[PDB]
Amino acid sequence: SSPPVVDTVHGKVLGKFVSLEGFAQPVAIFLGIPFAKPPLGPLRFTPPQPAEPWSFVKNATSYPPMCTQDPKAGQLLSELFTNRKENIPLKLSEDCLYLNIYTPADLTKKNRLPVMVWIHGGGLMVGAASTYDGLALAAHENVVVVTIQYRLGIWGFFSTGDEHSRGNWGHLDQVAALRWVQDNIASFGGNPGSVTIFGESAGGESVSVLVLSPLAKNLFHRAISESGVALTSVLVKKGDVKPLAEQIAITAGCKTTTSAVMVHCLRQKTEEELLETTLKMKFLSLDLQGDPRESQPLLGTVIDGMLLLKTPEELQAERNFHTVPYMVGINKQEFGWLIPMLMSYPLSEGQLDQKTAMSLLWKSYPLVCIAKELIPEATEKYLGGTDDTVKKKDLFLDLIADVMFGVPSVIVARNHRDAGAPTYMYEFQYRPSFSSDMKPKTVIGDHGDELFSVFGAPFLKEGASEEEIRLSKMVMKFWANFARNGNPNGEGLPHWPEYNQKEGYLQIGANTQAAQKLKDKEVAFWTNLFAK
Amino acid sequence: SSPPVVDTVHGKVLGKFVSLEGFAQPVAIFLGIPFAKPPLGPLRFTPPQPAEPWSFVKNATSYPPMCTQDPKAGQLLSELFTNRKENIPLKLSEDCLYLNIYTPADLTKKNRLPVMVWIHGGGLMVGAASTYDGLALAAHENVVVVTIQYRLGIWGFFSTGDEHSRGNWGHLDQVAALRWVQDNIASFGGNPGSVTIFGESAGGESVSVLVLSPLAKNLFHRAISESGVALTSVLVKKGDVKPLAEQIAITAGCKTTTSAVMVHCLRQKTEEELLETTLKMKFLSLDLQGDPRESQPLLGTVIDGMLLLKTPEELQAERNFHTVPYMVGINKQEFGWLIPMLMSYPLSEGQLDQKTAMSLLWKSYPLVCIAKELIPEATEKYLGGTDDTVKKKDLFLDLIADVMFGVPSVIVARNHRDAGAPTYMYEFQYRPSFSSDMKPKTVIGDHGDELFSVFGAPFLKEGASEEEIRLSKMVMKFWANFARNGNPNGEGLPHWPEYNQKEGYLQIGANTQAAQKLKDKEVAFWTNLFAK
């Protein structure tokens, strides 16, 4: 059993065979395949260029570096979200435009399996492909799993609001990886005519952005957004991006005389200087002093005129997006622990009175975008029904989650539905055994909790209950069925209704069953509140 | 009245409407339109590259930076030459390849007005387009006024005398702006088939250089050189440019091992380091210790084999230049105050004996190029007729002016005439009220004094006499008539004869009238003196 070697457009790559319990045949894995030229030097803040071809056989058996990011938050996220038994050491580099492939196909024969391309999350600031082991999903469901990387943070999203640094470099990377998949995936036994993009959090927003982008035409055939869409407004910068660009430049020690000056100066800084700039900006944290409307906890997607021609809201109203089957889902308690913990969010005392709730909601402006005049109505609605300050804290977490994830996700699915595309929603409500031990036991369906199920963590890690094992089997089959057919349903599975005018969705957890009208009262409350 | 928005080849630009007293309709102004890619990084000391196109609408309502230059001399020149009521704050940057447009045309209709493209002065070392407000000229004469920028100083003119840094980058910028005008000016209501280039001092030399250059073919149809031509020898470096190149490199902290080494090293220096290099070289100053033949108060035009194929003298003798109508003029006292003040020239004591005159003329070698053996004849001719040391100083200033401006200008006009082209000359003899208060009251027709009239300073600034107002009206109409027709004459205007074999020219001032044989005895004296 000599190792698997296949042809890419840029030359040959060598992978490794790995076995999984319960399967007679191994899965072929390829780690660290480049899909573009490393974006170093003058290639910073420019679109991804094609990779240089290589002679002989590239050894693709080592994990690539993760894109430069805060190593504290980035390592923490990898540890909390990995489906693998052990945490892998990951290097940081600007040289990070790699993908990893897991294929169960026999590479000596023509195979055209459905391909699932995973776009990780981490607020467009942190994260790695290598965190997510495709082995279980590939073997259990007979799909090719591709995990991709894309530039993060300053490297990925620096925008001057004009032609000197349009922005969205990370998204163009995601597009470039999808073009690589079109050109190459058949050598790995994948069907370039059946590509499903899926991602969580910022990866779900990225998926949503690709559904909105003419650059992504002909590159995918199904989409799945898990806890994140293009209406998750913390990730999309509308209006004037030039003052945040200037703040970044000034922090880096660059003059702000013109756009071209700022971008040129930043292209001169070392990786290290830019990482120090990143840390000094205190991204992924809330500012508790200063005008909340000027606070930017992350850099993000911009309306650049190449990837996105208008705002997501405008493109939606026009029905100008790709009408592929789209599954959009949320977890029950999206702001229950993970996100506030990662942001060092002030709610640690375990309780909240209504006056404190109101100033904190105001400080939370970059996350929720609620004008100071709307704060009292918003707060009263969620917290005003109880005098218990412990329960006020919990309802406050629901408020944040509803505004960041629940409402945006339902709005996106309704528009997608009304454009005539097949649409499905879920709400995931389970507390995984793989949860952090600092996470309170009452938090069920936290941000990220579905990832263990989707990626088959019970098959790779120790300690899963029988119920968790079955939950993962069901979720993987739903997801792969959707990749195959644009419909997650099939034999042995609870019925998942289409999200049509009755708004059927699947509640996923210990008691998986269909329900209707996910977040309906919350969409009505918020959209009408925001409309003055 | 929504703001004016028009299409360029690189995308849409938004300007602003501005009103002028006595005109019912406003003028559309566009500030800071890029005509090339910012020449940063590896684009230093290389020709201008095309601008990157932009999405959406570029807001062209802020003044661009001026090209990097000594801020003392550059700010001073802007204050002394601006026709505007107030001094505008200007930034310095290498990112300076912009132009500003003033158009009186209705941009919703096809308009094809004559276009006048202004090339500012400042010894190819300082200056800015934004100094010159086109509003009055555009409204009074119904022309499109374009003020352009071009690289200055080291950035603009660094030459190794070979293919690694040919030089004349500022001139190729001027050519690139003219190509932009050809491609775009119709959207601004201009006639690309009627473009007049005009400039003063180094801008007049630039105009003269374009008349001599095959690169400028088909780019303009009339020319005007005000106090500066390609025979103003201080601006043109013939012979060996490599020792000044080496001195620049050494000052910057670069090795001089080869040409390519020097240019590559200089491309690594920060803007600031190069500006510090500029100041340490003491450009725009006379060296009063050391061999005057090695003194270089400015970098300048070189014979690079692309822009200029031979020396101006050789091209003239061959009649190898563009035979467009050309107006060439001087002021009465070109070295009366402005230039010696800007150069910290030694003549401040108000008088000069004949022995001191002679060593000072020798120190003035980079300005006048008079061999030490010719000094006594030159000095005797100008100063030898009086024993009054005050009047010796004044005749000495005439000597300098005659050699730098008067003689060169007449030689250029005679050659242009003898090639069969329409040619006109003027001598401007007026002391503007806008003169500096440090300028002695006896100086009339100083370097720059015509600019107030040409640009309609009486219509924008406070304090002009009725006579100044009429002088500007006359000068603007002469200039615009020339732009339209290649002949400045028209109804209501004093008769301006062609510069033909009788050498008629116009004396412009309080008593505007025709005369003959401008500087005839001075051309005879100097050309024969220089011919040993």
Added chain:
Amino acid sequence: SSPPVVDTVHGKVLGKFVSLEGFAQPVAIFLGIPFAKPPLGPLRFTPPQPAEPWSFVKNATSYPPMCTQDPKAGQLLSELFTNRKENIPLKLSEDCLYLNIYTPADLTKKNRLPVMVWIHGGGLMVGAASTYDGLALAAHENVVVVTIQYRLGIWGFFSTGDEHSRGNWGHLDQVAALRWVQDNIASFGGNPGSVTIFGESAGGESVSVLVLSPLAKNLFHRAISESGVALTSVLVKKGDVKPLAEQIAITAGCKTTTSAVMVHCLRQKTEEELLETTLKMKFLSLDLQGDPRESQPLLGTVIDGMLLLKTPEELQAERNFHTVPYMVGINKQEFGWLIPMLMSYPLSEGQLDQKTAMSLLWKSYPLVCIAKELIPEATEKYLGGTDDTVKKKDLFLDLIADVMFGVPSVIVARNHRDAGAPTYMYEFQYRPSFSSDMKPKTVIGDHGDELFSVFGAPFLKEGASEEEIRLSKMVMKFWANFARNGNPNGEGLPHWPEYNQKEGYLQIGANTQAAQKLKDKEVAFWTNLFAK
């Protein structure tokens, strides 16, 4: 007699006429003609790019810089090997892609003389073209002599073992100069259809590498390797080059996270930093502490997939190489003084016992590649026949020479012969009067000793005996005859048999005569020892 001016593809070049005693007509010399763009900045560790064309006439009368290298070893080598009367001052620069031409042809008439292109030696770490004056060879034999430069050391040979820095930049330079010769040499009176490559030491290995390379197709018609071939294993790195690449990066102060990171970081270092890196690595020295198998005294040729598709041994076994006439030769005592002196090799005490011999042979692993288990047999064979420790030292020097030069050269000639190509060998056995005064008088046919004869040092330097004069005349005629005809023989010359199955070769020295079976017993001993 105005100076010679000729047309190249990139523009005109001006040379100088130089006279040589005994010749009525001068030789035209051109020094410092560029054949590529200077490899500065982003062009480091990339193939040579075409030179930028120039206007007017390039003055080619100054020696170019030598490629950046250790100035101690590089200056020393130039002084020891120059055939010229005096040592010329040479600058160091990365800007070094120049060649020098010596032509005896009348440049006003069509001349098509044989061209001999010299590739200097210096272990791919040091050396210069300008060291070798082509004047005598050009005049005596009526050939055009071209001496070329190529990148050395880190600049020339840095390889990551993949597509981010393939390596062999110096060899691609050699190829680029040969393409320049094809395109241009006719203007210098040379026949582009008769080009002979010749070189010594690393230059002989380079010649051998070109015979093995599909890139060199159609670029030469005869080859001569003097004391160096592609089987001189110290110059060719097989197996894993990544740890030496990492050591270089670490020494330079670069991270080793990925290949692209290392190469990008090294492209940021100044020439000086890289030269300091070079010196800190102690190239051209033996490491007397540490594992000899990890010791790298030079960077070298790699199997890059562009220049060399497989190992030299593999290409030979396949008969996949250019079957041009090839003369391969060695000197009698290749390790007699020059090389051990340049490497600060431990054998200075003048004697060697057998136990010390054995550990020193082990330390010499990077030069000879003899596995520790083979050491006792190798040492016994050479030193075991005498108890005289002085003679043991001399036999030890023979051992090294046989493994580095003698055996490899004969193997190469046998393979070339067996492919059906015309092949000739020599062994040079003379002690030049131009030898260093530190060289012991008993050393005859040291590394480099033939260069004086080949380049006509007796005609340019002082002090040659009549016999040396005749030896040089004979050697130059043999070499030039070979350039003309692929056969060195001719009237007035001792008979030089073909290297056929009888293995005839020429012993060159005071008594020049044919012999047979050069190093036959040594090839048998070593090839069978290495085959376990």
